[PDB]
Write an enzyme that holds these catalytic residues in place. Structure first.
Site, PDB file in Angstrom:
ATOM      1  N   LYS A 196       0.785  -1.177   0.048  1.00  0.00           N
ATOM      2  CA  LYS A 196      -0.074   0.060  -0.031  1.00  0.00           C
ATOM      3  C   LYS A 196       0.885   1.356  -0.069  1.00  0.00           C
ATOM      4  CE  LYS A 253      -5.166  -8.602  -3.571  1.00  0.00           C
ATOM      5  NZ  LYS A 253      -6.706  -8.159  -3.870  1.00  0.00           N
ATOM      6  CE  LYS A 262     -11.725  -3.416  -2.088  1.00  0.00           C
ATOM      7  NZ  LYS A 262     -11.114  -2.023  -1.367  1.00  0.00           N
TER       8      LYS A 262
HETATM    9  N1  LIG Z   1      -8.172 -11.134  -5.996  1.00  0.00           N
HETATM   10  C1  LIG Z   1      -8.845 -11.590  -4.838  1.00  0.00           C
HETATM   11  N2  LIG Z   1      -9.331 -13.094  -4.930  1.00  0.00           N
HETATM   12  C2  LIG Z   1      -9.801 -13.324  -3.751  1.00  0.00           C
HETATM   13  N3  LIG Z   1     -10.148 -12.633  -2.726  1.00  0.00           N
HETATM   14  C3  LIG Z   1      -9.935 -11.333  -2.500  1.00  0.00           C
HETATM   15  C4  LIG Z   1      -9.063 -10.867  -3.584  1.00  0.00           C
HETATM   16  N4  LIG Z   1      -9.133  -9.331  -3.371  1.00  0.00           N
HETATM   17  C5  LIG Z   1      -9.637  -9.028  -2.118  1.00  0.00           C
HETATM   18  N5  LIG Z   1     -10.108 -10.410  -1.719  1.00  0.00           N
HETATM   19  C6  LIG Z   1     -10.867 -10.594  -0.423  1.00  0.00           C
HETATM   20  O1  LIG Z   1     -12.176  -9.868  -0.387  1.00  0.00           O
HETATM   21  C7  LIG Z   1     -12.488  -9.287   0.813  1.00  0.00           C
HETATM   22  C8  LIG Z   1     -12.725  -7.769   0.498  1.00  0.00           C
HETATM   23  O2  LIG Z   1     -11.589  -7.141   0.111  1.00  0.00           O
HETATM   24  P1  LIG Z   1     -11.203  -5.527   0.800  1.00  0.00           P
HETATM   25  O3  LIG Z   1      -9.989  -5.107   0.510  1.00  0.00           O
HETATM   26  O4  LIG Z   1     -12.459  -4.846   1.046  1.00  0.00           O
HETATM   27  O5  LIG Z   1     -10.791  -6.399   2.341  1.00  0.00           O
HETATM   28  C9  LIG Z   1      -9.982  -5.811   3.369  1.00  0.00           C
HETATM   29  O6  LIG Z   1      -9.064  -4.868   3.027  1.00  0.00           O
HETATM   30  C10 LIG Z   1     -10.162  -6.434   4.610  1.00  0.00           C
HETATM   31  N6  LIG Z   1      -9.072  -5.845   5.530  1.00  0.00           N
HETATM   32  C11 LIG Z   1     -11.545  -5.654   5.386  1.00  0.00           C
HETATM   33  C12 LIG Z   1     -11.590  -5.824   6.694  1.00  0.00           C
HETATM   34  C13 LIG Z   1     -11.466  -4.741   7.656  1.00  0.00           C
HETATM   35  N7  LIG Z   1     -11.769  -5.678   8.825  1.00  0.00           N
HETATM   36  C14 LIG Z   1     -12.139  -6.847   8.771  1.00  0.00           C
HETATM   37  C15 LIG Z   1     -12.407  -7.951   9.537  1.00  0.00           C
HETATM   38  C16 LIG Z   1     -12.513  -9.082   9.081  1.00  0.00           C
HETATM   39  C17 LIG Z   1     -12.386  -9.422   7.799  1.00  0.00           C
HETATM   40  C18 LIG Z   1     -11.976  -8.350   6.810  1.00  0.00           C
HETATM   41  C19 LIG Z   1     -11.864  -7.166   7.342  1.00  0.00           C
HETATM   42  C20 LIG Z   1     -11.225  -9.770   1.631  1.00  0.00           C
HETATM   43  O7  LIG Z   1     -11.664 -10.782   2.352  1.00  0.00           O
HETATM   44  C21 LIG Z   1     -10.165  -9.935   0.640  1.00  0.00           C
HETATM   45  O8  LIG Z   1      -9.462 -11.050   1.232  1.00  0.00           O
END
Ligand SMILES: Nc1ncnc2c1ncn2[C@@H]1O[C@H](COP(=O)(O)OC(=O)[C@@H](N)Cc2c[nH]c3ccccc23)[C@@H](O)[C@H]1O
Ligand SMILES: COc1ccc(C#N)cc1
Lengths: 323, 333
Positions: free
Chosen positions: B112, B194, B197
């Site tokens: 990041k 990866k 988004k």
């Molecule tokens: N290319 C990909 N392939 C498969 N899975 C993926 C891919 N990109 C993203 N993910 C998963 O999607 C979820 C949401 O992404 P975020 O960036 O919002 O996800 C995040 O940045 C977290 N830190 C948000 C969060 C905040 N507090 C939490 C507590 C529990 C679980 C999750 C959270 C995520 O589960 C992420 O693993």
């Protein structure tokens, strides 16, 4: 009235320097300013400590501030953790604080010890604070709070007041008893250098008796910080307690030895501390009164803090909570 | 009472098929089996600078997306992170039981800070601690996430155990729930990276709210490999693109990789891409049809947020009270 914010550590073993200096100064300005006293228990836990002692120290600090003359109907006094807005704003301001700014503050360290300057910024900015009475060690922290405020305001409009340091010093001078060249500080490891506010007459006599003086012959009670640091410190302490001027005390001790000075200083200081201690124990042993002070204070603080936080949240773009 | 599931997603960028496969798909399927709580983590989103109007709109876009995917507010608690002050409160407290070194060693912080060099803020650094607070507040047993959140999960387990060791059974030690396929969906023109988004290159990404026609074109143009003859076989090292397409197909259809390999025996990448495009185009058309129904119903979205924050606050307040009592704070009147 300008808003003044002060954080009170629930662990600081306060000295006569703290009292006769800053605290007595501020007790007599509670109608001039809108004063806020925040017992900073969330800051305290950046250092690990016994839970029961922390709880006790929070109440000890509250009762001591009340004993010193902080009036909960004039000023706002509350426990930091009782107002969620502090933590909420703290997180938000993390996102407008550079990592570099925190790393530049003066791997086995906990993240709280790294991040607490941002929480301090939140503590201040929540209450639209105009003035912050800081010591030298907190100058960097205040500067960061001002930079965060200006940075956020430049992005979103005038949401925060930019706080200023409270410049004028109390005027009381209290130096360390065995090292009269340095200030009496509540952070001193060597406790023989300080007189704590809860010490009894016997402890004070013992510490004043030990206090460093000079080898002048004949012994002479005269003010001279350069050549007679110890005797001068005893005079300054005595003057701060009684309100008598230095030249008045010099005349009073004409032809007297340092033993007689030390005896008068001990008596004067302990006279002051005995009245403070009466009030302290009265407040401290009344759990119902302390609970009411904390509840009232948190309610006052929360009303103000919530208004600022709502403006911050609206500015940032968060979806408003559904109540 | 059922074991508790918690997970979140940021209202920043535009959720991809990656986010669906790694997380949201599992979220939908766990709703009866466990007590599920799902969060729109707007406080995490602001670690990257966003326009205020974009943030607000994206929060509601994300909420409507959960609903469109099948997240039922009668079964699951759905809420916005900033509506529950306990997240911030516990996050501060947990800073004091997290080491600087644990945060500085994070992969996500380093990735990041590379991408957002002009805004290496303290929130980006402190990100994992708030995330730990998000999970630990709800006595969470299971956390459905993609592979990229594994390290953040490990820290939240370490913090829980560390805190519990001092104070007693205050937190549950949560376990990750990472799917067998689709845990880390890769970029279509860069299959060693990866799928993100927030990718500048839109052609790397399949957006959940992207026009299906545009998505089918992206699949057709996905990079494969120089193998002669073309062979549909799983090999992340030498066949990253083809492997990613098989992984996507497996995750949508529920079919295993060996099943798909046998299925594509004698076929080439045209067949693979046709079947992937078909499966994904179908999913997104359905998903997007439900989406607008929810997204334009502001009264319903308001009710879901109100009810969810109420349910969440009840749980979070319980946990924070125990945490505050244990660390030694004077209890609020
Ligand atoms: N290319 C990909 N392939 C498969 N899975 C993926 C891919 N990109 C993203 N993910 C998963 O999607 C979820 C949401 O992404 P975020 O960036 O919002 O996800 C995040 O940045 C977290 N830190 C948000 C969060 C905040 N507090 C939490 C507590 C529990 C679980 C999750 C959270 C995520 O589960 C992420 O693993
Ligand atoms: C800088 O102060 C804070 C840092 C993190 C949190 C959280 N959650 C709350 C306050």
């Amino acid at each position: 009235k300008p808003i003044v914010f002060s954080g009170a550590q629930p662990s600081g073993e306060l000295t006569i320097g703290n009292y006769m200096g800053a605290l007595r100064q501020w007790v007599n300005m509670q109608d001039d300013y809108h004063c806020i006293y925040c017992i900073v228990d969330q800051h305290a836990i950046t250092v690990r400590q016994d839970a029961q002692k922390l709880r006790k120290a929070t109440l000890d600090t509250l009762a001591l501030y009340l004993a010193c003359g902080i009036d909960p109907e004039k000023s706002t006094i509350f426990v930091q953790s009782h107002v969620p807005e502090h933590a909420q704003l703290g997180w938000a301001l993390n996102c407008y604080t550079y990592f570099g700014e925190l790393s530049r503050m003066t791997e086995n360290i906990n993240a709280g010890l790294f991040d607490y300057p941002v929480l301090m910024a939140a503590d201040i900015l929540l209450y639209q604070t105009n003035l912050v009475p800081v010591g030298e060690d907190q100058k960097q922290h205040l500067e960061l709070s001002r930079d965060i405020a200006q940075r956020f305001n430049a992005l979103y409009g005038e949401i925060f007041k930019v706080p200023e340091p409270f410049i004028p010093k109390s005027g009381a001078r209290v130096m360390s008893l065995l090292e009269p060249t340095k200030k009496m500080s509540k952070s001193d490891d060597n406790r023989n250098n300080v007189i704590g506010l809860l010490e009894d007459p016997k402890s004070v006599v013992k510490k004043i008796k030990r206090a460093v003086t000079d080898s002048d012959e004949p012994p002479v009670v005269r003010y001279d910080v350069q050549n007679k640091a110890g005797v001068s410190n005893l005079l300054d302490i005595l003057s701060a307690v009684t309100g008598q001027s230095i030249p008045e005390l010099e005349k009073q001790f004409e032809g007297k030895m340092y033993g007689h000075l030390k005896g008068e200083v001990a008596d004067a200081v302990s006279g002051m501390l005995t009245e403070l201690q009466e009030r302290y124990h009265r407040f401290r042993n009344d759990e119902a009164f302390l609970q009411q002070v904390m509840k009232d204070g948190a309610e006052k603080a929360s009303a103000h803090a919530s208004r600022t936080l709502k403006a911050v949240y609206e500015a940032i773009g968060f979806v408003a909570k559904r109540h």
